[PDB]
Structures are given as C-alpha cells and as structure tokens.
Design an enzyme around this catalytic site. Structure first.
Site, short mmCIF file in Angstrom:
data_model
loop_
_atom_site.label_atom_id
_atom_site.label_comp_id
_atom_site.label_asym_id
_atom_site.label_seq_id
_atom_site.Cartn_x
_atom_site.Cartn_y
_atom_site.Cartn_z
N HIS A 58 0.80 -1.22 0.00
CA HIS A 58 0.00 0.00 0.00
C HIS A 58 0.84 1.28 0.00
CE1 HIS A 58 0.28 1.12 4.27
NE2 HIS A 58 -0.19 -0.05 4.68
N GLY A 86 2.66 6.20 10.33
CA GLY A 86 4.08 6.06 10.02
C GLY A 86 4.68 4.73 10.47
N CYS A 128 3.59 1.66 9.60
CA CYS A 128 3.45 0.56 8.63
C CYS A 128 4.82 0.03 8.20
CB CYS A 128 2.61 0.98 7.43
SG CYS A 128 0.87 1.28 7.83
O1 LIG Z 1 -4.05 2.35 8.97
C1 LIG Z 1 -3.33 3.19 8.46
C2 LIG Z 1 -3.59 3.68 7.04
C3 LIG Z 1 -4.26 2.60 6.22
C4 LIG Z 1 -5.56 2.76 5.76
C5 LIG Z 1 -6.19 1.75 5.05
C6 LIG Z 1 -5.52 0.57 4.80
CL1 LIG Z 1 -6.35 -0.74 4.02
C7 LIG Z 1 -4.21 0.40 5.22
C8 LIG Z 1 -3.59 1.41 5.93
C9 LIG Z 1 -2.30 4.15 6.34
C10 LIG Z 1 -1.50 5.09 7.23
C11 LIG Z 1 -1.11 4.39 8.51
N1 LIG Z 1 -2.28 3.75 9.14
C12 LIG Z 1 -2.04 3.41 10.51
C13 LIG Z 1 -1.43 2.22 10.92
N2 LIG Z 1 -1.18 1.88 12.19
C14 LIG Z 1 -1.53 2.74 13.14
C15 LIG Z 1 -2.16 3.98 12.88
C16 LIG Z 1 -2.56 4.87 13.91
C17 LIG Z 1 -3.22 6.03 13.62
C18 LIG Z 1 -3.51 6.36 12.30
C19 LIG Z 1 -3.12 5.55 11.27
C20 LIG Z 1 -2.43 4.33 11.53
#
Ligand SMILES: O=C1[C@H](c2ccc(Cl)cc2)CCCN1c1cncc2ccccc12
Ligand SMILES: O=C1[C@H](c2ccc(Cl)cc2)CCCN1c1cncc2ccccc12
Ligand SMILES: [Cl-]
Ligand SMILES: [Cl-]
Lengths: 305, 300
Positions: free
Chosen positions: A41, A143, A145
């Site tokens: 992603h 950040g 991921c």
């Molecule tokens: O979940 C996501 C986003 C996303 C959205 C949809 C799909 Cl299918 C995948 C990823 C990408 C940015 C990073 N993020 C996050 C990942 N871990 C902790 C997070 C804590 C607060 C805010 C965002 C967080």
C-alpha cells in the site's frame, strides 16, 4: 524471581529497518540481503486505496519512484515486484547486518516481539500475541506501517508479522513476510472490523504455572476436572477450547510445579466462575493470555540469543 | 492507537554485553570502549558475602584472575579497579560496537528498559521502574548479575542501572554505573529488606492522561481537589505524595487533553475510592504506575 512481559532482544532486527518513500508516503521496510520488504500500500494515494488494482498501480512505478534510506545512506532500488500484499524492492547493496533469518507464519495464540519503527528508525520493542480473531493489540501510530514482528529460535530470527493497518477499534492488522494477511483483512480502504475475540486458554494456563513458579498459590485447589467438562466452561466464558495438544505442551510446566494440567484447569474454572476475590496473580487483576507455555519456560529458565 | 509497556530497542546495549568470570563465579559485564563494568561481588565466594572486605579481596587478584569473553573471543584484562560497588576491568581491546552513551543516576519513579543477560548473552528486554523503595520489580534469575537498565532518547544510551542482587521478597537491587546502590542496600548478605513500597502517583496520573488521549473518559468526574487534600487522601492508599514538580511535569499532558492536573487528581481519588466497577483502563484492571509523563508523551 519476577515475571515480566518480555520481548526478544531486538538488535538483529534493528539492523534491518529502513525507510521507504513512494510519492508523499513514507513507511518502514525490512532490508534482508538485497531485498527491502514493505507493505504494497506504500504505492497508493488516498483515492487509490478505495479500490486499488495493485498490479496496475505498480506497473506505473519505476525503480527511482522508490526512495530507500538506511540510516543516512540512500540505497539504489534496481528492481521491484509484488508477492501477495508485500512489495519487494531489489536494492543494489546487500545488508551487511542481515541476520540468520526465516519467514514463518504464526498461529493465533502465538506471541511475538514487535519492533515499532517510524521513518526507518526503531522506536520501541514490545511483546504481543496474535489474537484468535487474527488482530494484534499493538501500539502503533501513523508512520508505523512496515514495522515487524519476530521471534528468535536459537540463533535465527523468525519474522512473522509486518504491520499494514489499524482497525476502527484501535487494534492492528498485518501480514506474514510472504504478504499473506493474518485474518480476513484486505489492504483497501473499506469497512473492516475485528471479529469477536476469545481468550487464549493454553496461554492463561501457562501464566498460572508461571505464577506458581514465582510463589503464588492462592488459586490452587484440591480439585481436578476432565478436558470435556473444562471445555464446556471455556466455551461459556469466551475462552478458546483446550485441546490434547495444549495439554501435552503444558507437560513440562506441570512436571516442574507438580500441578497436573487438568488440576490447573480446575483452578482456572474456579477463577472464571468466582473471579479473584480482590486478589491478584503476578501483579494482575485479570487473567493474562499473552504468554505462551514456551515463553514461560524461556523466562523462568533464562534462554539467551 | 494502543498503549503498551514499551522498551527501548536493545541492539545498542546487546553489542556491549560480555561474560565475566572470576574463579567459580560467572556473571555479565558491560563493555564500553576499553572498560568492562561489572558488580564487584564477582570477586567473592558465597562465604565472603556476610562481611566482605572488597579492598582486601581485590588486592589479592591479578588481571589474569578475570576472564572476559565477548562472543566467542577472550578479551585480555590489563587493569582492574573498583569504583564504589562496581568493578572496572580495563581490557586490551576497545568495543567497536560502543554506542554513544552516558551514565545517569535516576530518581524513584523513573522508568528504564532492562536487557536481562546470562553468560554474557542477552535473553530478553522488558520495561521497569525504579520503585519509591529503590528496588525494581525485575525478572531475573541466578546468573543475571551485571545485566543493565537503560534509556535511549535521541541515539544516546543512558545507562542507569546494573543488577547486583535479588532481595528475599523477589524484588531486585542494584547500582547506577558509578557503583552507587539505589536505596539503603549493600552488596553484603545482611538483613536489609525492601522498605514498604508505594504507588508512583505522578505515573498513575500520566497513564490516566494516556487513557484520555486514547479515547477513555469514563473515570473523569465534575470535581477538582486541592493538591494538599489530594495528598491526604493519596497517602491513605499508600500512594506517593504528588509535589508541585509533578504537577508542572504533567502540564503538557494537561494542555493536550484539556484536563487540569487537579481535575485528573480528583478522578484518581474517585478511582481509589470506587475501583473500576468491572471496567478496564488501557487493558488493565489495576492503576498502572510504570509509565512516566515522558513515556506517555513519547508513545501516544
Ligand atoms: O491504517 C493506516 C492507514 C491505512 C488505511 C487503510 C488501509 Cl487498508 C491500510 C492502511 C495508512 C496510514 C497508517 N495507518 C495506521 C497504521 N497503524 C496505526 C495507525 C494509527 C493512527 C492512524 C493511522 C495508523
Ligand atoms: O542475588 C543473587 C546472589 C547474591 C547474594 C548476595 C549478594 Cl550481596 C549479591 C548477590 C548471587 C547470585 C545471583 N543472585 C541473584 C540475582 N538476581 C536474581 C536471582 C534469582 C534467583 C537466585 C539468585 C539471584
Ligand atoms: Cl494511503
Ligand atoms: Cl556471591
């Protein structure tokens, strides 16, 4: 003495963390030999995430669209490919700090250490478990991921998790290092939720043995039970069924403490039906399920890496 | 989201752990540049521990009485000296993996990561706090002496603890890296016993602010308290007094959540009075005191 939520030493993994930037998005990558692994992603814009065709999005990117930074050094991307939900960026430099490693897919109930990273830099390490609902109750911010989960089996790092997303309830979802998601999750911006979770029974039993090893016996009783009677109680209290394999795996702890597995099941059965009555076990008022039988043996024996 | 007991990545410290042997005893040493630091009790027998005279025991040792092993390589000891309760073994090789480091002595309530080691090999990492009674509730077995506690804020490792002993209640005592014990403890087998421990109030408050940041407000109330009334109530539950310094240190968390420190104190008073009523706060049924205000800001 003492019993702590203990993670594996993270040094062998820290030497693999890199920063991966694609367009406006920066996340973490795992640099093993000449390949940097990261969530696919990373190539998506917010609009792309609604309905991504990853093959189509990836064919539009060239090597120079991926900026990989290892410390204060830029790595040259010389190839890119996708394996399930992981992007593999072939780099022109092999990681000299690559440890002896394997990619392993873990089962729900298995625990692992997470090295949380931001901008390719490790921030912290914590221990967690793959819930029966395939989520992890991690601690992750925007950040994070690409941060990875691992165990150390002798001198080998077994990478088992890569962080991909946070679900609406604040729990996390990710893949193994071959890019296969744990759970029925997808890497697309759509309605997704964690299913109802259950307690990891074999792990609660292992933790009760750790409490007995550490000198806590108030929950012990003269009673025993059968696997079938106990499994009826487990079902009632949203606990995972205890199998004969779980009973066999608890054998060493049972022998060390002199408390038969079904003898401890009767203690657990009583704790579920009556609570702790104002008491604690290893400094906890809740039954802890994020220590496996092997974690208990390893911590109470001092296994090194 | 999420809130975990998070340790610092241990790599920078793992590259410093060595095995130190003197006679029959083997424990861990911290190899920084050309010096290996370890508990001075490595030079003792079990019988020497009742009333050891470390100066007398040390004068009898030569460099070759100390065997230092870093990985599968023996280091040559070329000097030895004692600084308080720490033995400093000068070695002929500087640790190429020496990180940017400092020795810091911490105050009770401070947290740090512990890299538990056996035979100079790291076994695990966990988060600890220096208790108000100057002990640490660690996880250590026989052979863990010399394991260290540290913090790593901004690439510099701040070593704050070196493990020396387990007390009769199963809690642990050690020194800073200058060899000064935390608490009224000595590296001597004597009745020293941990004093009655108390809860680190400023840390419970910080953790309550972490819960508010993470979306949990069920425990808040319409009340406030004076600082002195808070302390009078708090002491009745074996909580540490909250000082004006603690109130100032909680300022950033207070500003971020919009909950004044004394309004959070009122909520803590009510939690102590009522319990959680079957509820949890950040996955815990007990009030957690091993997260500092700085740790909450770092993690949340
Ligand atoms: O979940 C996501 C986003 C996303 C959205 C949809 C799909 Cl299918 C995948 C990823 C990408 C940015 C990073 N993020 C996050 C990942 N871990 C902790 C997070 C804590 C607060 C805010 C965002 C967080
Ligand atoms: O406390 C000690 C011993 C000791 C005795 C006297 C003096 Cl003054 C210092 C040290 C030496 C051996 C290691 N040891 C231990 C240290 N940490 C955890 C232990 C868990 C179980 C058993 C022993 C443990
Ligand atoms: Cl996105
Ligand atoms: Cl001794």
């Amino acid at each position: 003495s003492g019993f702590r939520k203990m993670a594996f030493p993270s040094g062998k993994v820290e030497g693999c963390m890199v920063q991966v930037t694609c367009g406006t998005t920066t996340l973490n990558g795992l640099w093993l030999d000449d390949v940097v692994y990261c969530p696919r992603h990373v190539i998506c814009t917010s609009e792309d995430m609604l309905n991504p065709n990853y093959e189509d999005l990836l064919i539009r990117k060239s090597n120079h669209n991926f900026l990989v930074q290892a410390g204060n050094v830029q790595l040259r991307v010389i190839g890119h490919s996708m394996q399930n939900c992981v992007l593999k960026l072939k780099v022109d430099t092999a990681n000299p700090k690559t440890p002896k490693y394997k990619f392993v897919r873990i089962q729900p109930g298995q625990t692992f250490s997470v090295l949380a990273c931001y901008n390719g830099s490790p921030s912290g390490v914590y221990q967690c478990a793959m819930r029966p609902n395939f989520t992890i109750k991690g601690s992750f911010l925007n950040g994070s991921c690409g941060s990875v989960g691992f165990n150390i089996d002798y001198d080998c790092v077994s990478f088992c998790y890569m962080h991909h997303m946070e679900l609406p309830t604040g729990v996390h979802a990710g893949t193994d290092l071959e890019g296969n998601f744990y759970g029925p999750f997808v890497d697309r911006q759509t309605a997704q939720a964690a299913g109802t979770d259950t307690t990891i029974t074999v792990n609660v039993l292992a933790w009760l043995y750790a409490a007995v090893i550490n000198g806590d016996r108030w929950f012990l009783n003269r009673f025993t039970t059968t696997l079938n009677d106990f499994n009826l109680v487990a079902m009632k209290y949203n606990y995972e069924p205890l199998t004969q394999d779980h009973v066999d795996i608890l054998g060493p702890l049972s022998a060390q403490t002199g408390i038969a597995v079904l003898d401890m099941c009767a203690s657990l059965k009583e704790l579920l039906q009556n609570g702790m009555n104002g008491r604690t076990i290893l400094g906890s008022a809740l039954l802890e399920d994020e220590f496996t039988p092997f974690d208990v043996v390893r911590q109470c024996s001092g296994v090194t890496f």
